[PDB]
Amino acid sequence: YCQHFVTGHRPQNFIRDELIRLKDELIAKSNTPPMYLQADIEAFDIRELTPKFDVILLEPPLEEYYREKCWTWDDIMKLEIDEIAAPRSFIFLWCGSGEGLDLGRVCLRKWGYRRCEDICWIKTNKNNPLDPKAVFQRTKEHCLMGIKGTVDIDLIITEEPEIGNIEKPVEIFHIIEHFCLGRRRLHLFGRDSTIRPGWLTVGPTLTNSNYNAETYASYFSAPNSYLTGCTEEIE
Amino acid sequence: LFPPQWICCDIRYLDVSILGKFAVVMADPPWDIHMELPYGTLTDDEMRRLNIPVLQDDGFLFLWVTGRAMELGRECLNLWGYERVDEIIWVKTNQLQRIIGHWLNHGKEHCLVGVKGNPQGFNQGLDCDVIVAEVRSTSHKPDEIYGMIERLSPGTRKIELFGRPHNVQPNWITLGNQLDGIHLLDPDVVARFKQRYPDGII
Ligand SMILES: CNc1cc(N2CCC3(CC2)CN(c2ccc(CN4CCC(C)(C)CC4)cc2)CC(=O)N3C)ncn1
Numbered sequence: 099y100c101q102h103f104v105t106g107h108r109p110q111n112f113i114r115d116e117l118i119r120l121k122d123e124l125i126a127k128s129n130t131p132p133m134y135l136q137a138d139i140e141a142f143d144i145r146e147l148t149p150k151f152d153v154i155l156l157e158p159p160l161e162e163y164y165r166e167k168c169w170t171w172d173d174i175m176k177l178e179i180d181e182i183a184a185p186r187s188f189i190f191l192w193c194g195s196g197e198g199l200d201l202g203r204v205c206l207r208k209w210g211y212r213r214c215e216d217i218c219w220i221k222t223n224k225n226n227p228l229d230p231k232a233v234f235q236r237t238k239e240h241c242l243m244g245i246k247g248t249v250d251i252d253l254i255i256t257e258e259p260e261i262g263n264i265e266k267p268v269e270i271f272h273i274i275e276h277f278c279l280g281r282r283r284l285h286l287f288g289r290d291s292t293i294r295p296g297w298l299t300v301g302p303t304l305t306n307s308n309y310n311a312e313t314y315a316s317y318f319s320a321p322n323s324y325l326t327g328c329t330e331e332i333e
Numbered sequence: 334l335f336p337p338q339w340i341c342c343d344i345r346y347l348d349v350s351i352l353g354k355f356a357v358v359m360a361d362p363p364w365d366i367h368m369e370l371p372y373g374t375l376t377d378d379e380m381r382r383l384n385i386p387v388l389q390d391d392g393f394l395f396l397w398v399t400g401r402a403m404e405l406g407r408e409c410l411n412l413w414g415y416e417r418v419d420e421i422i423w424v425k426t427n428q429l430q431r432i433i434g435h436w437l438n439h440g441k442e443h444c445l446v447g448v449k450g451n452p453q454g455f456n457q458g459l460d461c462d463v464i465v466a467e468v469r470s471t472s473h474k475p476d477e478i479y480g481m482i483e484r485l486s487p488g489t490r491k492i493e494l495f496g497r498p499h500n501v502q503p504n505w506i507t508l509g510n511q512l513d514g515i516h517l518l519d520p521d522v523v524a525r526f527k528q529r530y531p532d533g534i535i
Pocket residue numbers: 342343344345361362363364371372373374375397398399442472473474475495496497508509510511
């Protein structure tokens with residue numbers, strides 16, 4: 099399929115697409131009401147975000163996303179992620195496909211995680227048959243998964259979004275939610291368009307906020323402190 | 334000499350200086366991932382000590398990685414003097430073109446791409462960084478990679494490390510401990526081999 103692409107159809111164009119539904123129902127029953135907060139994260143003391151999070155999804159705006167305010171990996175690496183991650187907790191970091199695949203591993207280690215998974219968003223161009231340093235045409239992005247402390251594949255196939263559309267596939271949320279890692283879930287650099295039950299979203303472009311640390315923590319005070327997000331809510 | 338050449342040996346102990354410079358290096362090391370061990374692994378220091386740096390002055394390295402070798406192979410890649418500029422992934426499928434790490438099921442294998450020096454006269458941009466191809470034997474890499482490497486750097490000298498017999502290819506010198514003897518055809522190589530190994534024992 100590589101000589102074929104050399105037709106314009108990326109080889110991934112030709113990839114051809116029982117419970118697991120109860121789990122989705124339990125996740126949805128468990129999900130806290132969406133909460134969200136506009137914040138200029140460059141200038142915002144992360145430490146106001148409490149309690150410590152079980153899952154952090156981190157989707158900073160890389161310059162490469164805008165081919166046609168961008169964060170550099172310098173900026174990203176100064177974020178004090180470790181100050182808000184729970185002792186056992188997980189991170190999912192969108193790294194793009196350039197230097198981010200190396201610099202994001204530095205971030206992971208800098209903040210205390212080890213990588214257990216590399217999740218690839220493979221982008222088809224079925225509807226539409228370069229970086230200087232690039233050798234090959236880049237048709238995918240990576241989302242690095244990190245652990246600290248003690249059903250799905252590592253692939254996501256969708257069609258390349260239109261130029262300037264920066265959204266990531268909503269399937270990242272499904273993968274995360276199916277791990278059952280905790281209910282304290284934080285999405286940094288989310289948007290109005292990504293807000294989602296079971297999640298706290300912080301980002302500079304949100305147009306409304308409803309965050310309240312006390313109200314937020316109240317969702318996890320006993321007897322709900324350790325719920326995975328995948329069980330029957332305690333009655 | 335365009336036809337296949339190869340060298341059965343332990344790559345730890347072969348004097349790879351006799352082989353000359355290459356425009357492409359490819360390696361599928363038996364990293365010490367996790368544990369298991371259904372084949373002979375090389376320790377991490379053995380991996381960093383490998384004399385990769387003498388094989389190239391300007392060109393590209395292709396480094397298969399898995400598990401914790403995604404980090405280690407990045408280290409070796411940098412220690413040997415390359416910059417990782419791309420990452421090929423191979424989506425492993427079946428005949429119906431459907432898809433075949435304790436947290437997620439693995440649908441892919443990774444190959445880091447490194448550059449060293451100022452390579453010139455290569456056709457960067459012809460292929461894309463995703464390979465979709467069916468799985469052959471265990472620990473078997475897809476032949477699509479050789480096509481991609483040929484289109485990238487056609488006619489140039491290439492060398493594979495830790496190749497297995499099926500991996501012999503025109504333009505390539507395969508090194509691996511499961512190959513049949515020593516098959517060399519390029520005159521400058523046969524010269525420096527006989528100089529360095531007069532009695533044919535590594
Ligand atoms: C001791 N020093 C040596 C060693 C050596 N080898 C190394 C071992 C060798 C034969 C040549 C290769 N090996 C192996 C197995 C698995 C992998 C992992 N890879 C698999 C395929 C992939 C592309 C999907 C990506 C991941 C890599 C190598 C299996 C095996 O049985 N053998 C005998 N040659 C010379 N000196």
